[PDB]
Symmetry: C2
Subunit: 105 residues, 2 copies
């Protein structure tokens, strides 16, 4: 077992957006970000746009605990976002799970 | 939104994971002290314990450029060089939010 103990629960979410919905996607994701940073135990909810390709986005969603992260998918703003952007995805989003080694807190 | 973020993907050789973590700890501890640093998160994939991410975020591109001139960066780069199972990839982003 080569896994280290996590100190933050992180999901890097990769989104490829339809070419004519990039602004629409940013606006919808702004709303998600604004509410998500207020969730208990949220440590980051950074919204990123690829320098090389504006249709490529990342949501970097970091929480103190896994159960804090789990609660996110229960929120109205998540559910709203998910339904809103569904038709603007050029392909399925992928979420990759990480454990935070540093900072330790 | 102008935060500058580089996501660095590292694939580490199987018997170098503990050493990689320690060498990168020392890089993290110094890098979070750099003017304009906003994150320097060090992450291990839950899917594959040999894959790591350094999430390096700065207030400006200029601050990010400075990191690569620091003694701690140069030492880290030299230390971990032979432990990479394949070339590291850095992917550059602009942080839209937080603004």
């Amino acid at each position: 077992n080569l896994y280290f103990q996590g100190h933050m629960y992180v999901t890097i979410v990769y989104a490829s957006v339809k070419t004519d919905k990039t602004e629409a996607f940013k606006e919808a994701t702004r709303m998600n970000h604004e509410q998500s940073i207020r969730e208990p135990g949220n440590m980051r909810f950074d919204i990123l746009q690829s320098a090389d390709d504006p249709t490529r986005f990342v949501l970097y969603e970091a929480y103190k605990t896994r159960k804090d992260a789990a609660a996110h998918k229960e929120t109205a703003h998540y559910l709203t976002w998910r339904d809103t952007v569904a038709d603007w995805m050029a392909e399925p989003r992928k979420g990759v799970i990480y454990g935070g080694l540093y900072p330790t807190g």
